[PDB]
């Protein structure tokens, strides 16, 4: 890889610079290089990895949605034939998105997950696996769509099982996992009741544990709890 010659610490330093400069493609490439050094990641380094790829794929998803909407409108009755260009360009963006997802999944499989023994790290990586399979599922239309959806579900479920056994109900990683798995249920698995149930139970169990927290931990937990509430409001 192109980052093979750069020191691990320098890659991390530059990922932080790239973040400050809002250069998320660079940030992701630096963090990929750092992962490929083969050492486990710290908490901060996991955050850098996730922020980088979330921002890159987030942009791709937004672009894909714009293009897919234009494509859908083109295939309505009364729409003038404009040739293959809309489909082609949607496919181009789609293929790039799939590439980034495959890259992230590859880092998780080689070898982040298998070396992650602490609950926080294992849950975080399994959540990421669920997330990137979910992004693949958003654009899937073929023979494998069901298996892609099930790959997302399986990763999220393993993360949920560990999180419930090993982490308090206010832990931000546990909360974020539940938020995202709930969205998976609503948007991907066609299970809006399960989505709502998950978000509500997660919110309520966190509420009951806030009394145990410092001011700073309270801030962190309540921020994600508000996201759960926001989704519940959208869905009910």
């Amino acid at each position: 890889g192109a980052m093979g010659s750069m020191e691990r610490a320098s890659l991390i330093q530059k990922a932080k610079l790239a973040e400050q400069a809002e250069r998320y493609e660079d940030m992701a490439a630096f963090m990929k290089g750092a992962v490929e050094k083969g050492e486990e990641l710290s908490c901060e380094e996991r955050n850098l990895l996730s922020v980088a790829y979330k921002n890159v794929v987030g942009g791709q998803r937004a672009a894909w949605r714009v293009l897919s909407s234009i494509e859908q409108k083109s295939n309505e009755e009364g729409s003038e034939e404009k040739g293959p260009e809309v489909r082609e360009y949607r496919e181009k963006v789609e293929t790039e998105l799939q590439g980034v997802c495959d890259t992230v999944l590859g880092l998780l499989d080689s070898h982040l997950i298998k070396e992650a023994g602490d609950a926080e790290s294992r849950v975080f990586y399994l959540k990421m696996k669920g997330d990137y399979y979910r992004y693949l599922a958003e654009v899937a239309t073929g023979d494998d769509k069901k298996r892609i959806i099930d790959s997302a579900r399986s990763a999220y479920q393993e993360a949920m099982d560990i999180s419930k056994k090993e982490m308090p109900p206010t832990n931000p990683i546990r909360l974020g996992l539940a938020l995202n798995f709930s969205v998976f249920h609503y948007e991907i698995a066609n299970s809006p009741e399960e989505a709502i149930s998950l978000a509500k139970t997660t919110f309520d169990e966190a509420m009951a544990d806030l009394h145990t927290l410092s001011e700073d931990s309270y801030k962190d937990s309540t921020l994600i709890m508000q996201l759960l509430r926001d989704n519940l409001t959208l869905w009910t």
Binding site: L179, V183, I224, D230, L234
Partner: peptide, 5 residues
């Protein structure tokens, strides 16, 4: 779109 983190 719903919130995710």
């Amino acid at each position: 779109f719903p919130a995710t983190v």
